[PDB]
Amino acid sequence: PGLLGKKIGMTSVFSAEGKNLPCTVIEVGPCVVTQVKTLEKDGYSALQLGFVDAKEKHTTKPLAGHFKKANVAPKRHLAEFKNFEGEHKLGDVLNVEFFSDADFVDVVGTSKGKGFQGVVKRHGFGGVGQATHGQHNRLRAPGAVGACSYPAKVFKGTRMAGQMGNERVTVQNLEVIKVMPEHNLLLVKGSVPGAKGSILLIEK
Amino acid sequence: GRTYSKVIKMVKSPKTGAYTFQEEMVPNEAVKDFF
Amino acid sequence: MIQQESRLVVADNSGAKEALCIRVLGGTRRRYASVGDIIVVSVKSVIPSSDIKKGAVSKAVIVRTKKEVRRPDGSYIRFDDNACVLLNAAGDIRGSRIFGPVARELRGTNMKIVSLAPEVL
Amino acid sequence: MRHNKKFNHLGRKAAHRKAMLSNMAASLILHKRIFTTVAKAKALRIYVEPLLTKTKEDTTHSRRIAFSYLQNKYALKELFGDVAAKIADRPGGYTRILKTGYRLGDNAAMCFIELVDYNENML
Amino acid sequence: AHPKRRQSKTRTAKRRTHDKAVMPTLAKCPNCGAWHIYHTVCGDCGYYRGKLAIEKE
Amino acid sequence: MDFIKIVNEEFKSGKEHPKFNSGDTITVEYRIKEGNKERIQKYRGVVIRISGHGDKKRFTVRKISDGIGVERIFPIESPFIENITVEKYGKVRRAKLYYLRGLTGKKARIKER
RNA sequence: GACGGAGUGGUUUGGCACCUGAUGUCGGCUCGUCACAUCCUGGGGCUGGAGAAGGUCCCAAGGGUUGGGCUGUUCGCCCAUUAAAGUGGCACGCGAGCUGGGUUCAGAACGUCGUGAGACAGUUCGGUCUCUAUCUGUUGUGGGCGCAGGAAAUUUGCGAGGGUCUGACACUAGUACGAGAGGACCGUGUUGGACAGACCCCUGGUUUACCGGUUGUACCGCCAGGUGCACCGCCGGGUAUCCACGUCUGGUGGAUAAGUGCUGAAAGCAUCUAAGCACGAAGCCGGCCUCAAGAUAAGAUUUCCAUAGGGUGGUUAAAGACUAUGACCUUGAUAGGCUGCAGGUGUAUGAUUGGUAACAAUUAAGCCGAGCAGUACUAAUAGCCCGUUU
RNA sequence: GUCUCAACCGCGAUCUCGGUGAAAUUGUAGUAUCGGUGAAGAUGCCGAUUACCCGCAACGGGACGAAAAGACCCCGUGAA
RNA sequence: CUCGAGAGAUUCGCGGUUAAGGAACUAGGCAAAAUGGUCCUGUAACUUCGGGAGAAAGGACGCCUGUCGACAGGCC
Numbered sequence A: 001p002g003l004l005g006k007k008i009g010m011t012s013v014f015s016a017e018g019k020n021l022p023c024t025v026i027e028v029g030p031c032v033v034t035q036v037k038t039l040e041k042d043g044y045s046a047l048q049l050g051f052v053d054a055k056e057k058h059t060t061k062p063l064a065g066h067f068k069k070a071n072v073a074p075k076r077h078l079a080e081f082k083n084f085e086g087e088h089k090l091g092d093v094l095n096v097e098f099f100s101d102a103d104f105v106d107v108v109g110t111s112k113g114k115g116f117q118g119v120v121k122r123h124g125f126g127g128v129g130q131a132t133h134g135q136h137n138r139l140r141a142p143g144a145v146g147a148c149s150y151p152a153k154v155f156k157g158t159r160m161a162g163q164m165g166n167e168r169v170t171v172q173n174l175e176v177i178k179v180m181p182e183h184n185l186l187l188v189k190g191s192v193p194g195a196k197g198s199i200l201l202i203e204k
Numbered sequence B: 001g002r003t004y005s006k007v008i009k010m011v012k013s014p015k016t017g018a019y020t021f022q023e024e025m026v027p028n029e030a031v032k033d034f035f
Numbered sequence C: 001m002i003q004q005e006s007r008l009v010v011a012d013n014s015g016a017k018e019a020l021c022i023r024v025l026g027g028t029r030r031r032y033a034s035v036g037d038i039i040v041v042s043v044k045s046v047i048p049s050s051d052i053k054k055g056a057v058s059k060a061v062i063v064r065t066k067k068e069v070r071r072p073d074g075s076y077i078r079f080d081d082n083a084c085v086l087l088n089a090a091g092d093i094r095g096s097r098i099f100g101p102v103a104r105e106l107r108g109t110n111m112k113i114v115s116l117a118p119e120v121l
Numbered sequence D: 001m002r003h004n005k006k007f008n009h010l011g012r013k014a015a016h017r018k019a020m021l022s023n024m025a026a027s028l029i030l031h032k033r034i035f036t037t038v039a040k041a042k043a044l045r046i047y048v049e050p051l052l053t054k055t056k057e058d059t060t061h062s063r064r065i066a067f068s069y070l071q072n073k074y075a076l077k078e079l080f081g082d083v084a085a086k087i088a089d090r091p092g093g094y095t096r097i098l099k100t101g102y103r104l105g106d107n108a109a110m111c112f113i114e115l116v117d118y119n120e121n122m123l
Numbered sequence E: 001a002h003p004k005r006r007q008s009k010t011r012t013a014k015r016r017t018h019d020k021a022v023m024p025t026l027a028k029c030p031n032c033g034a035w036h037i038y039h040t041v042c043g044d045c046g047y048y049r050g051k052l053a054i055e056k057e
Numbered sequence F: 001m002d003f004i005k006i007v008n009e010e011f012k013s014g015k016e017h018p019k020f021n022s023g024d025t026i027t028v029e030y031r032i033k034e035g036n037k038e039r040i041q042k043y044r045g046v047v048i049r050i051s052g053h054g055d056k057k058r059f060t061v062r063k064i065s066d067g068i069g070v071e072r073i074f075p076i077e078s079p080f081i082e083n084i085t086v087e088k089y090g091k092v093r094r095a096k097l098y099y100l101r102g103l104t105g106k107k108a109r110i111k112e113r
Numbered sequence G: 001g002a003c004g005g006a007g008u009g010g011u012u013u014g015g016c017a018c019c020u021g022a023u024g025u026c027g028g029c030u031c032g033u034c035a036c037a038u039c040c041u042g043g044g045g046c047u048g049g050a051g052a053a054g055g056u057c058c059c060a061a062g063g064g065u066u067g068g069g070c071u072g073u074u075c076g077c078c079c080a081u082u083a084a085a086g087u088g089g090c091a092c093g094c095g096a097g098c099u100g101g102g103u104u105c106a107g108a109a110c111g112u113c114g115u116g117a118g119a120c121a122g123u124u125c126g127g128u129c130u131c132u133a134u135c136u137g138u139u140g141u142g143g144g145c146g147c148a149g150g151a152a153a154u155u156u157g158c159g160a161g162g163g164u165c166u167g168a169c170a171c172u173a174g175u176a177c178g179a180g181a182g183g184a185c186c187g188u189g190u191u192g193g194a195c196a197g198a199c200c201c202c203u204g205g206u207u208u209a210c211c212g213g214u215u216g217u218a219c220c221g222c223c224a225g226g227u228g229c230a231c232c233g234c235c236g237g238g239u240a241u242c243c244a245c246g247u248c249u250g251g252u253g254g255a256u257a258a259g260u261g262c263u264g265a266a267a268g269c270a271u272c273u274a275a276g277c278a279c280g281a282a283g284c285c286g287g288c289c290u291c292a293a294g295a296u297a298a299g300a301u302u303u304c305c306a307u308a309g310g311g312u313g314g315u316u317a318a319a320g321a322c323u324a325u326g327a328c329c330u331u332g333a334u335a336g337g338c339u340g341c342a343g344g345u346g347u348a349u350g351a352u353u354g355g356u357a358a359c360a361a362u363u364a365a366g367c368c369g370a371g372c373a374g375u376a377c378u379a380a381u382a383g384c385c386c387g388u389u390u
Numbered sequence H: 001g002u003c004u005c006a007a008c009c010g011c012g013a014u015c016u017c018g019g020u021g022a023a024a025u026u027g028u029a030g031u032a033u034c035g036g037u038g039a040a041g042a043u044g045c046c047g048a049u050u051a052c053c054c055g056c057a058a059c060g061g062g063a064c065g066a067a068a069a070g071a072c073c074c075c076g077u078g079a080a
Numbered sequence I: 001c002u003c004g005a006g007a008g009a010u011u012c013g014c015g016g017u018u019a020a021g022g023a024a025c026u027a028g029g030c031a032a033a034a035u036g037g038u039c040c041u042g043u044a045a046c047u048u049c050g051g052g053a054g055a056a057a058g059g060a061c062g063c064c065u066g067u068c069g070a071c072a073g074g075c076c
């Protein structure tokens, strides 16, 4: 179970024990239950939540009929979480106090996009040779890609250049520093994937 | 020392029917809960 | 941040003056040694008529580094040089006096250095 | 990567790029409208609008600061004369870019940039 | 480095599947009635978004 | 709204200190611990750098002790700082005094203001 | 474990001469992948195993398996570590991937042989490593059509890939065992090293945005004040972004192997097996993370249409080679500007007053502000096309 | 910054668009994988396996890739 | 300097900076960094008596005031 959040930024705080802690500020805003999924109809049990208020100009008619059925204000983001405890129904509202009993959380996000990257940065390759001592033009090269006539091919899973980042990433067991119900704010120790303003899933 | 103790009970098994062996290591002041 | 081939000042009255790090102990590819770490050195130079000899192999403990050291309270400390103190086979120090400041990290490793140092941090 | 690098190098070295932006700005102050490419005109907008904002504080320091950019005394004479009076009430957005088409020789996107307070038909 | 074989007619034509001239994005001018590229000033009349932009002699 | 600014206010630590700039000579009363005994250990030197944002600045103070240079970085909001007193008001022409690392006595002296 | 004997393999030296109008060769670098005949870590049987430490054999390939001195070296010797510094195959893996120290061209010299031209179970100094990737292969990223009407979302997971390491201390306990020296199993805990992922609050780096000092010289008609050029002229700083040297997080029931047994006959006894049954590994499968319905077997759910929904276009981005993706397009804060603020630099131009002067103090510092907040001033026209909309 | 061990910055090349436009190479090709077989090292044979149609960027394992009628080695009642 | 315009991936060419360490790189310090000017001090072994030698190692250097290139005071 969990809620949807928005990454705000990082800062550092001093604890009561007198330690300097890096913290990440997340706005785990109010989430409405937009659809209840059950065994007998869907094959599994889960809750679909909606997070960011959306204007009607930005909501298509199929999605408008989706929120109107649940009788809630239309939302911009939708996600599913499982294994709750309390049997929330359509149109209920959840908030940061859900985590007021939580010691650690998981944060799922999308990492920053690096674009197309070479083997040195994508996979940490050593590079060919030195910068001097007869080096010509293979300073950031991958080297050999396989053996000779047997195999006579490049194996699947060979590490090469390509797109790096902009992908789903999970960070586990983040210590909760404080919950602020007034501002829908959650404080966790450490860093989380993604740029400022990105949408995060926080699992209890 | 005196920070745990070993507890064993035997439960019948649906796969076969004969008694298996259940084992753990719980702190000394918790076996009465287990048994 | 001391590694193999680094040269350190010898900061006790053991007779040695300059030392060269041969190995950072405690791990297969342990790259660097900080304050309070144990290293193996060769003595590169000595004062005339000293006890230890030039070219001897010895264990030592780092007391000062140029790279700043982080503390859990958010403070840092750095020094103008890298310095160590020679130790004997039984783990004790081979000298009487310590010259210059030493870091507070050694309060958890060796009380002999801290007791007889002019200042800690 | 170029995350959050907010200025166009325009395919030129830094000294070349600064010289072109300064020559172009002088041309816009002297001739109220000039025709150029779209990428060059969008880069001039970020360059010339703060310079036109300096004529709201008519002092020796403002004129000299502006002159350190243009280095052209006819542009300074026009900028702090007729151009200053026309824009005295507008809160930014002194210039306008309108696209026109493509060049014959390299198919470059073309446009015109002008001072808004000198175009009567668009007011 | 070198082609082992010349390509057949079929293989060459299959690659050229994605070689297409791009069509302009055209619109009619509400003043002139002439074709012009959307989001540009009509070169015939000089108008743009209902207002005169390039008074042409 | 602004959430970093809310958090910084809720987790405010430390006490007010008198203002000082780079090139000033200050004494830091720092609280240390050794065998469950708390005592204050003075550290006096010249401020060579201040960096950061707002109430979260960090300053670097340098002193020469027994002929060895020593540098300490202090968070301004730390609860371990008891007092800051300014001994001398220095006179410098720049923000960062990294050049004092290469000057010995009679050449590292700073004019008063 | 002698004297002897039977096999297996094809990584050594050979034997044969079957492929070759050219099938690049030693060592190293880079990148790996596979085997197990296992170096460490896991599980066992025996011991000439008191304990501790070993010896030997069996099961086990999940992960891991150092840096230097000498040498072209492989290999070795040595130094210091480590839990350990495994053995092999892949054209003695890998030169359209690198190098070119060695070998094996033309110069020269030594020893040696030859009358000599020259030569070497030898030695020594020097001596050009070519090619714009067609097919396939591999890593990424799109276009079309399909999915039994068309669409906007949320999904299950058939399966695939990734991940899998390990030390040292404390207590139990100076106890069991042992005249004694020494010194445990089992079980709780506390802290490290290496590796990987994400991130930029901190430390540190960059920062041809920016600010300042300064040399030479030429321009803005002159002075003062600026600017061009000299590697960004040189020097000192430096936000955002990108980073590591930084910070945070991670390596989490079933069926078995070698083995241990219960009950128990064939075979009156014996027997873990023949009928049954209880155990038993870092290994297998689940569990963790990512992808994943072209899974043509093309799945499921909610809603819309039969103006649903899109394309082209525009302002743009922490998204990006081109694409694709995200936000916004006037009943709009998408970008710039403007107005303030965090911030960088470090006290401007002028004007007084000091000083004989070079200079200095007052007065607002001045400039910049890739970040933040507000604000329609500028640019975002529903025009055209498929099936009311920006 | 030779390296531990790399990080960042600038221009030129690179990528996209407009204009012009070669070359080496080429029996025909709708040119997948594994093991086997085989002029004894297989895209093309056998048995299985996997794979909707068509591009772009990037890297070099194979096509005993390209170039040059092997200089080594032997042979010719060859040559200098 | 007879092709341009955009954009600002990988990679290459030519350049710039870099914490801590400082030849651990490599066949080999290859390449790069470092030194560098004028004047005043001071210069070893060895030597064919010429040299070695610019051996090595040190110090001063801008502007203003006055005094006889130098001296002293002052300024950044």
Ligand SMILES: C=C[C@]1(C)C[C@@H](OC(=O)CS[C@@H]2CC[C@@H](N)C[C@H]2O)[C@]2(C)[C@H](C)CC[C@]3(CCC(=O)[C@H]32)[C@@H](C)[C@@H]1O
Residues within 6 Å of the ligand: G022, G023, G024, G025, G104, H070, H071, H072
């Ligand atoms: C020229 C032939 C090469 C490049 C190399 C050849 O090496 C030799 O000929 C060593 S002799 C040497 C030759 C040059 C003379 N100037 C001096 C003399 O000393 C070598 C290693 C083999 C022994 C024969 C086959 C081979 C293909 C596979 C391979 O590994 C190659 C042939 C076909 C290859 O094209």
Ligand SMILES: [K+]
Residues within 6 Å of the ligand: A151, A152, A153
């Ligand atoms: K093959």
Ligand SMILES: [K+]
Residues within 6 Å of the ligand: G207, G239
């Ligand atoms: K920065």
Ligand SMILES: [K+]
Residues within 6 Å of the ligand: G333
């Ligand atoms: K705005």
Ligand SMILES: [Mg+2]
Residues within 6 Å of the ligand: A112, A113, A114, A115, D001, D003, G319
């Ligand atoms: Mg990106």
Ligand SMILES: [Mg+2]
Residues within 6 Å of the ligand: A126, A127
């Ligand atoms: Mg490297």
Ligand SMILES: [Mg+2]
Residues within 6 Å of the ligand: A134, A135, A136
């Ligand atoms: Mg070369």
Ligand SMILES: [Mg+2]
Residues within 6 Å of the ligand: A135, A136, A137
């Ligand atoms: Mg090169």
Ligand SMILES: [Mg+2]
Residues within 6 Å of the ligand: E015, E016, E018, E019
């Ligand atoms: Mg094409």
Ligand SMILES: [Mg+2]
Residues within 6 Å of the ligand: none
């Ligand atoms: Mg073989």
Ligand SMILES: [Mg+2]
Residues within 6 Å of the ligand: none
């Ligand atoms: Mg051939």
Ligand SMILES: [Mg+2]
Residues within 6 Å of the ligand: none
């Ligand atoms: Mg085995």
Ligand SMILES: [Mg+2]
Residues within 6 Å of the ligand: G092
């Ligand atoms: Mg080989």
Ligand SMILES: [Mg+2]
Residues within 6 Å of the ligand: G095, G129
């Ligand atoms: Mg080659």
Ligand SMILES: [Mg+2]
Residues within 6 Å of the ligand: none
């Ligand atoms: Mg090859």
Ligand SMILES: [Mg+2]
Residues within 6 Å of the ligand: none
């Ligand atoms: Mg010869």
